[PDB]
Amino acid sequence: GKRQTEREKKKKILAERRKVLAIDHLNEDQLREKAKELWQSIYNLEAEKFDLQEKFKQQKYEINVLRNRINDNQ
Amino acid sequence: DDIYKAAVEQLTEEQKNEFKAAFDIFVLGAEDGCISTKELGKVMRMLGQNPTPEELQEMIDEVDEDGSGTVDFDEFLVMMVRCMKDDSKGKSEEELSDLFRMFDKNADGYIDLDELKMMLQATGETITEDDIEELMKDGDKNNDGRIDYDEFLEFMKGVE
Amino acid sequence: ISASRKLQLKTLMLQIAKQEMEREAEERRGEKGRVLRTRCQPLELDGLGFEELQDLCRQLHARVDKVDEERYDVEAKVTKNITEIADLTQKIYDLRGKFKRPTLRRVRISADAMMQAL
Amino acid sequence: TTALVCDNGSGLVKAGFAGDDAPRAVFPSIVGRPRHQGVMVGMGQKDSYVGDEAQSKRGILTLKYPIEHGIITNWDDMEKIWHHTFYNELRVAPEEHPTLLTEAPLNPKANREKMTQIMFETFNVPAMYVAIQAVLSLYASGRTTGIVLDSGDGVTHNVPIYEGYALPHAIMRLDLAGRDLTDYLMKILTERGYSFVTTAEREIVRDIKEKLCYVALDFENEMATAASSSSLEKSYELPDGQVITIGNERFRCPETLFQPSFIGMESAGIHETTYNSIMKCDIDIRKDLYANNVLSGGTTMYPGIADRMQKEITALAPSTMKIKIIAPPERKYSVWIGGSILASLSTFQQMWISKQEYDEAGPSIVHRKCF
Amino acid sequence: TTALVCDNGSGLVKAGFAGDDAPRAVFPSIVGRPRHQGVMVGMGQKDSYVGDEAQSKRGILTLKYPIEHGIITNWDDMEKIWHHTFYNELRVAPEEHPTLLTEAPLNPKANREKMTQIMFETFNVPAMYVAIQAVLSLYASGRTTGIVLDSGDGVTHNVPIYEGYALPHAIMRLDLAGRDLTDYLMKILTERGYSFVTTAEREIVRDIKEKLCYVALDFENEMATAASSSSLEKSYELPDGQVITIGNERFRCPETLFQPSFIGMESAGIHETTYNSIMKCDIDIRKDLYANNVLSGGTTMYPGIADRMQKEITALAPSTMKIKIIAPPERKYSVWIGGSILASLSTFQQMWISKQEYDEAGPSIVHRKCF
Numbered sequence A: 001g002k003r004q005t006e007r008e009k010k011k012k013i014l015a016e017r018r019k020v021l022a023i024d025h026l027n028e029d030q031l032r033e034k035a036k037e038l039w040q041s042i043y044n045l046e047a048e049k050f051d052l053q054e055k056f057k058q059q060k061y062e063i064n065v066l067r068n069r070i071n072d073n074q
Numbered sequence B: 001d002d003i004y005k006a007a008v009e010q011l012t013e014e015q016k017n018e019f020k021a022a023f024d025i026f027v028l029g030a031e032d033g034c035i036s037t038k039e040l041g042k043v044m045r046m047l048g049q050n051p052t053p054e055e056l057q058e059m060i061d062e063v064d065e066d067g068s069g070t071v072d073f074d075e076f077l078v079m080m081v082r083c084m085k086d087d088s089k090g091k092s093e094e095e096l097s098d099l100f101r102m103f104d105k106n107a108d109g110y111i112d113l114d115e116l117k118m119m120l121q122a123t124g125e126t127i128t129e130d131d132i133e134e135l136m137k138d139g140d141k142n143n144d145g146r147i148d149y150d151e152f153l154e155f156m157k158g159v160e
Numbered sequence C: 001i002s003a004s005r006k007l008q009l010k011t012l013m014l015q016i017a018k019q020e021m022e023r024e025a026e027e028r029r030g031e032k033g034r035v036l037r038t039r040c041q042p043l044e045l046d047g048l049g050f051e052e053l054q055d056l057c058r059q060l061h062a063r064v065d066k067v068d069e070e071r072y073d074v075e076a077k078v079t080k081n082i083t084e085i086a087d088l089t090q091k092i093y094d095l096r097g098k099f100k101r102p103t104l105r106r107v108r109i110s111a112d113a114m115m116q117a118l
Numbered sequence D, E: 001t002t003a004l005v006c007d008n009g010s011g012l013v014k015a016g017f018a019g020d021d022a023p024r025a026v027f028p029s030i031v032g033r034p035r036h037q038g039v040m041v042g043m044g045q046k047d048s049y050v051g052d053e054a055q056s057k058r059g060i061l062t063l064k065y066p067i068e069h070g071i072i073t074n075w076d077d078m079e080k081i082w083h084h085t086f087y088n089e090l091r092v093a094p095e096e097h098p099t100l101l102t103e104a105p106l107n108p109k110a111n112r113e114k115m116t117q118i119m120f121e122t123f124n125v126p127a128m129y130v131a132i133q134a135v136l137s138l139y140a141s142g143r144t145t146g147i148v149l150d151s152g153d154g155v156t157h158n159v160p161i162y163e164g165y166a167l168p169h170a171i172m173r174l175d176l177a178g179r180d181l182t183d184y185l186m187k188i189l190t191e192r193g194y195s196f197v198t199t200a201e202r203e204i205v206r207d208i209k210e211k212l213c214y215v216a217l218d219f220e221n222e223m224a225t226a227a228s229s230s231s232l233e234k235s236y237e238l239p240d241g242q243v244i245t246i247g248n249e250r251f252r253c254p255e256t257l258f259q260p261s262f263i264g265m266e267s268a269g270i271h272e273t274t275y276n277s278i279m280k281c282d283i284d285i286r287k288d289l290y291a292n293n294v295l296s297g298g299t300t301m302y303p304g305i306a307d308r309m310q311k312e313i314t315a316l317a318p319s320t321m322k323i324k325i326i327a328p329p330e331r332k333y334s335v336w337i338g339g340s341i342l343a344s345l346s347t348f349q350q351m352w353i354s355k356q357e358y359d360e361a362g363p364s365i366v367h368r369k370c371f
């Protein structure tokens, strides 16, 4: 575990997330709007994951501080 | 501060009962009604309330800048009614932790006298002689140059 | 050691710290928007042909896959950090309990209440 | 709701709600039936006065303690004492309050099982828990290590604890306590002419012991001084006049603690059973136990015991270790204060023996995981 | 990024980032579960204290090393030790750092394969490489030839190297090391009255060995001198007082290295397995190996060993060759310093076992070209 289970979860996430790729079957407007909206969605995802990096770094620093605290007990 | 009017209009019966009890004990005749804090401290000590006794004495030696020697109603009355914890919400832990993190750009888990001086420059507060030593008292509870977020939390917890 | 002056000094330091932290968070949000514009480049399609949309959606699928995988990893990191935060919170809470919790109680809760009726 | 921290003890029952500083009601645990005939009609004479009421009518009663040495020898009287404690001294029905009894170490199982069966069937409490009398006294000191000598009135026991891990193989329980000191004092008072025999006069001898006796720093020097000068003879007024003068009986009564050969007991004093209890511990926690020796219990209130014990242990122990004896001024109620602290904890809130658990496993549940 | 130079060892785990002079965190490799019951509630008692934390609470623990003789006998405990080393002593997540473990020569394959499988699956490092503990100690000396005797705490091995070409047929691995010397010292201390039995007191005997024992230049003369005078008896204070006096146990404990018949081992001492390891080499590189004999490892820190070993080898070797014994003052961390130097090299940067390679060939990749 911990190497294929997470792999399986991310694979299923990609499968459900990556929708059908089929473009030249329809009018340009609908597909253009879909592409723009999904690009905006992944832009928001980039912002969210960047904020996650910042927050997780801050909490890692807090973990270091609390490690210093528990070290101060001896 | 000048919250004397707010305190005198905000208090409830629970402590105003003892306030009026000490009032009648104090003012009973042949007095101006100014009510000196000296006898008020003794009366409140007898009545069984639980403030800190030394802080009131230090304030009496310090407060009432007019230097009359008998603090008038507002300041010493507020210090008396300080038996009830009518505080300013006691601030918040997460906000102060964020403050400490913002100050801890050094990323070492502590804020030293250098960062304290930088903060004082940022606010533009008067240079006070208690500095450095105040950090040694509050922040340096172990005398090691280390101060975590809890020392700053209790440094001005519910400050008002 | 003054009392009123020191109280005013400390509360002013608190208020200034809070306002500076708010302004710093506003600056952080501005820099976040700047980074968002820089990396995830704006994509304009003002009157373009079909092949432009084809390329855009292809790059979209590639970037969506890579960013979702990356954020999956980052979310795993955040879950581990949350676990560490909870564990260390329990640790510090137990430390505080050992230090002060026994000292926490209702002393004279009724002993002073009942004085001389007996 | 709030928990009831009762503490049966042997000699004084101490009870009160959890979370306070001092027990609400403290009263001797004696039940005394009248012994004479009684001629006034309609006086409203009861058949048994318990608690502090029988310390005022003790002139015509035959007081008898229901707890001999930690163990309980007379269950009906103990039930009566508990009923009085709940209903008249606290006035709270037990149907709505958890209880936290206390028990000496190394006591018979049947005593503990009967105690829990009574609490669950007669008084019908929601949940009760039994705790060892020394761990509480360690709670009250705010420590987490240390070896506690809890010299009560029934039994003296010496439980060493390190980092929260009790050492079950190093508990040294000795049955010399305040009651034997009262009997020995009553026996040596006869050397001056004062004879106390009645079970009521044992209370007078107990009062003499409490108010006058003290522990000598050095025994032989005090014996020599009291035999030459007369600076020690302190007088005391009986409940009817006829003052008495106690000479070198003052420091000879509590000396029995350090030389149990006086009352014919073989074992070593409380100064040497502590050192033996330490030496049974592992070699790496002996310094901490040396530095954090804790005193508790009523009988350790003699004026000058915290110095005699330190001198004795320093004589026994290696010269390098530091010997420190913690003797808080609130020694008598230390066990109950610790009990209040323990009952007020949130982490402890799921350790109670809930009634449904007792219904499923019977009274033998107390020896199980819920200790 | 920077590489993590970990060095499991057996007795002290030494770790730190590549490119420094000394390991960042050095702490004993012991994992000790508590053994008593524990009565304080909410004390925050963990289920296993590892590393240097269990050398302070060792009074109530049962310490047990997870590495017996180079090989690893308890994989769960070793995983716990590694997790502690990465997260609490260095505070660097392993997802972003290559690792360079070290392994004794002639060890079982399964140990090495399990080590790499753990490092790649549990901690999920980018790339790890396993190196023989003697080549690193040769790196640290700045040589390129020489025969290195790396007498650790688990196992003593003697790898000869010439011009960078290791001689695989001349490695003489002997399983006498510091741990057996600790046990033998603990066994001969009983001849004066001091009995150490508990697994915690093994640490005290280890401290005695480190601080007092020394290697005698000539054994019989020292045995005769210690039996007549009293100029050798050095005293030492236990963790609780009661000083002890070590007589001729001082140089008899480390003498076991040169006469393994003391602990019943058949083989020859470390003074003769080096000469045998040299004589297996070719006839033309024996002079260089004679002149560049290197000492390493912790157990070679006894005061006076670099002279006894030289005297012994000079006795064995031909009279013309010059015998020189390199004993740097930084002997204990020699392997780790060499590991840092090796990890800091540019030529070595493509020898790591990259994760994609492991995914394609399984854990058996370590025996392949990426050694």
Ligand SMILES: Nc1ncnc2c1ncn2[C@@H]1O[C@H](COP(=O)(O)OP(=O)(O)O)[C@@H](O)[C@H]1O
Pocket: D008, D009, D010, D011, D012, D013, D151, D152, D153, D154, D178, D179, D182, D206, D209, D210, D211, D297, D298, D299, D301, D302, D332
């Ligand atoms: N001030 C005092 N001085 C000397 N002895 C005392 C004092 N107070 C109590 N004692 C002795 O201690 C006994 C009470 O001990 P206590 O701690 O109440 O026992 P328990 O552990 O059963 O509660 C009394 O019998 C009395 O002999």
Ligand SMILES: Nc1ncnc2c1ncn2[C@@H]1O[C@H](COP(=O)(O)OP(=O)(O)O)[C@@H](O)[C@H]1O
Pocket: E008, E009, E010, E011, E012, E013, E151, E152, E153, E154, E178, E179, E182, E206, E209, E210, E211, E297, E298, E299, E301, E302, E332
């Ligand atoms: N100063 C010293 N004097 C004598 N013996 C020592 C000294 N320091 C360490 N040792 C012995 O060496 C051992 C440590 O060896 P070490 O080199 O850490 O082994 P490893 O190869 O597993 O790291 C200890 O168990 C101790 O017995």
Ligand SMILES: [Mg+2]
Pocket: D009, D010, D133, D150, D152, D153, D297, D298, D335
């Ligand atoms: Mg008691």
Ligand SMILES: [Mg+2]
Pocket: E009, E010, E133, E150, E152, E153, E297, E298, E335
């Ligand atoms: Mg080694």
